[PDB]
Amino acid sequence: KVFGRCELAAAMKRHGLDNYRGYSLGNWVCAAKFESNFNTQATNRNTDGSTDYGILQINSRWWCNDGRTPGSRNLCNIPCSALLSSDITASVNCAKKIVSDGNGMNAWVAWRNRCKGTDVQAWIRGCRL
Ligand SMILES: [Cl-]
Ligand SMILES: [Cl-]
Ligand SMILES: [Cl-]
Ligand SMILES: [Cl-]
Ligand SMILES: [Cl-]
Ligand SMILES: [Cl-]
Ligand code: NA
Ligand SMILES: [Rh+3]
Ligand SMILES: [Rh+3]
Ligand SMILES: [Rh+3]
């Protein structure tokens, strides 16, 4: 599923991401924009052989099981395919664990490089929230 901007903002809010670990909703929307272009089915292979999955491009090296990332963990206790669902529950729940890991949203390199410090509220401007 390719979410609309405000549609994703609303789903993220209902699932408790607005101000989760202090990160306003716009930060989450901005991260999803540049990670996946709001597409739940996005996948990308990393140089190390791990793969990133879903709207927030969660990596198989630590967070989910895809059966093909040697030496990796599955800290979110989910198959990586669950992160590709039209239902964002699994991605949100796993994102909460990631953002709590110590480095906040810097875990998402695209957030650090493209969202951090910018006017992230723009991402939720106009949305019924
Ligand atoms: Cl957009
Ligand atoms: Cl915001
Ligand atoms: Cl594996
Ligand atoms: Cl594990
Ligand atoms: Cl599994
Ligand atoms: Cl933080
Ligand atoms: Na894994
Ligand atoms: Rh829902
Ligand atoms: Rh808010
Ligand atoms: Rh649901």
UniProtKB/Swiss-Prot annotation:
One of its GO terms (molecular function) is lysozyme activity. GO terms for cellular component: cytoplasm; endoplasmic reticulum; extracellular space. Keywords: Allergen, Antimicrobial, Bacteriolytic enzyme, Disulfide bond, Glycosidase, Hydrolase, Secreted, Signal. In the egg white and polymorphonuclear leukocytes. It comes from Gallus gallus (Chicken). It catalyses: Hydrolysis of (1->4)-beta-linkages between N-acetylmuramic acid and N-acetyl-D-glucosamine residues in a peptidoglycan and between N-acetyl-D-glucosamine residues in chitodextrins. Disulfide bonds join C6-C127, C30-C115, C64-C80, C76-C94. Its EC number is 3.2.1.17. The active site is at E35, D52. Belongs to the glycosyl hydrolase 22 family. SMART domains: LYZ1 (SM00263). This is Lysozyme C. It is an enzyme of class 3 (hydrolase). Substrate binds at D101. The lineage of its organism: Eukaryota, Metazoa, Chordata, Craniata, Vertebrata. Lysozyme C is capable of both hydrolysis and transglycosylation; it also shows a slight esterase activity. It acts rapidly on both peptide-substituted and unsubstituted peptidoglycan, and slowly on chitin oligosaccharides. Pfam families: Lys. Lysozymes have primarily a bacteriolytic function; those in tissues and body fluids are associated with the monocyte-macrophage system and enhance the activity of immunoagents. Has bacteriolytic activity against M.luteus.
